[PDB]
């Protein structure tokens, strides 16, 4: 693709700052209007800002919601777009898109991959993973669900791998929800009853931030 590409996305404690960059190689960067559009993980699209070009004395526009918090700058020299986001709030936490007007047809045409801005004061907590297993009863039919609860981490992502030697599983990976500050998640696997509990099931929960890898034999 032609690409707009953006970085400097991260974890900022509230009232912090980030210098989000965006890189657009294209025919005539020099001439188009450049946009910034957030998408908070909670719902939809909200335009943050926009900047015209040299001709239009770099007329800068902003959504009531970010005014004075943010500055949008451009540096044609290097085909760079910026966003100084000062004095942040938790509600700023969103995926930031770089958006390039297609001067010749319409505006708000080309959007890059995006990036992440996480605003929260919570620290980098590990995950407490606990294994869910029937209880009594044992095998109630042909197949049987097994699971892992991944309780209590920050930030955003964990990766849950299952060890179910070949066994005819159906792993559902469930989205994490926020839960009294830190996230929670769960994953299920279904096994052949004519292999449980002989066959050693395991769930493998890594956490990037804080290089943790807990394994939980399901028994």
């Amino acid at each position: 693709e032609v690409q707009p590409v953006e970085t400097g996305g991260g974890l900022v404690q509230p009232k912090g700052s980030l210098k989000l960059s965006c890189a657009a190689s294209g025919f005539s960067f020099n001439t188009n209007a450049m946009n910034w559009v957030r998408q908070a993980p909670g719902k939809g699209l909200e335009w943050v800002a926009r900047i015209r070009s040299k001709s239009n004395n770099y007329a800068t526009y902003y959504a009531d919601s970010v005014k004075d918090r943010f500055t949008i700058s451009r540096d044609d020299s290097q085909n760079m777009l910026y966003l100084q986001m000062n004095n942040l709030k938790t509600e700023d936490t969103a995926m930031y898109y770089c958006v390039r007007d297609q001067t010749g047809t319409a505006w708000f045409a080309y959007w890059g991959q995006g990036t992440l801005v996480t605003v929260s004061a919570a620290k980098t907590t590990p995950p407490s993973v606990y294994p869910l297993a029937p209880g009594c009863g044992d095998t109630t039919g042909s197949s049987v669900t097994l699971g892992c609860l991944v309780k209590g981490y920050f930030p955003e992502s964990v990766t849950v791998t299952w060890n179910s030697g070949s066994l005819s599983s159906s792993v559902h990976t469930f989205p994490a929800l926020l839960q009294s500050g830190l996230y929670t998640m769960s994953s299920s696997v279904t096994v052949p009853s004519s292999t449980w509990p002989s066959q050693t099931v395991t769930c493998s929960v890594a956490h990037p931030a804080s290089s943790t890898t807990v394994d939980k034999k399901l028994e």
Binding site: L45, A106, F108, A109, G112, A133, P134, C136, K151, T190
Partner: protein, 219 residues
């Protein structure tokens, strides 16, 4: 400040059905000079938005011959003809006639599959989690369709709860069915003063609830 109402927010479709996604603005978009800046976007899951049609009917450079925009003033209609799988994600309408750029809530083209009864499983709290000071009775309602589902929790019979965390998957390419997990997080103390734990899945493929329940004072 114009509110792009989309109709409808969910749209089940067989893969050779005509789809229709409908947008409606709170004001007239017929600019005083330019004309009807009503735009539709497509964003596939885990991805950036893509421009489809601009100014109601003007398709953008790539958009297959199956996309059809039309509408006047406050009523707009995105009509995909024969729904190819490549098209499933969220559809957005935008307005850029008035500052600020407002988008619609987005319409999700889901995929049609027959009705399915979920497999419910209740799991009791692992000794391992107890040893921290909390409890989670997880309930997995697995492989159902449609996504119209209601879970109810029963502690000793006493009705409902309020420490529940429901989380749905998106459409599971394969059986094509949604899965969902009701977590109930109690305190060690509370756990140990209450006996029977009930999950009661209320679904369309039963007039009678699918009840799964365990008994604290056992395994």
């Amino acid at each position: 400040d114009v509110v792009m109402t989309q109709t409808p927010l969910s749209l089940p479709v067989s893969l050779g059905d005509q789809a229709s996604i409908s947008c409606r603005s709170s004001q007239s978009l017929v600019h005083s000079n330019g004309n009807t800046y009503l735009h539709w976007y497509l964003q596939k899951p885990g991805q950036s938005p893509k421009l489809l049609i601009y100014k109601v009917s003007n398709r953008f450079s790539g958009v297959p011959d199956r996309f059809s925009g039309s509408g006047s003033g406050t009523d707009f209609t995105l009509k995909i003809s024969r729904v190819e799988a490549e098209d499933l994600g969220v559809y957005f309408c935008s307005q850029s006639t008035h500052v600020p750029l407002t988008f619609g809530a987005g319409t999700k083209l889901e995929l049609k599959r027959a009705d399915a009864a979920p497999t419910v499983s209740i799991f009791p709290p692992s000794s391992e989690q107890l040893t921290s000071g909390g409890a989670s009775v997880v309930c997995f309602l697995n492989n159902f369709y449609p996504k119209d589902i209601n879970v109810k929790w029963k502690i000793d019979g006493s009705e409902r709860q309020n420490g529940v965390l429901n989380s749905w998957t998106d459409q599971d390419s394969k059986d094509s069915t949604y899965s969902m997990s009701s977590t109930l997080t109690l305190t060690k103390d509370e756990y140990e003063r209450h006996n029977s734990y009930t999950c009661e899945a209320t679904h369309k493929t039963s007039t009678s609830p699918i009840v799964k329940s365990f008994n604290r004072n056992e395994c």
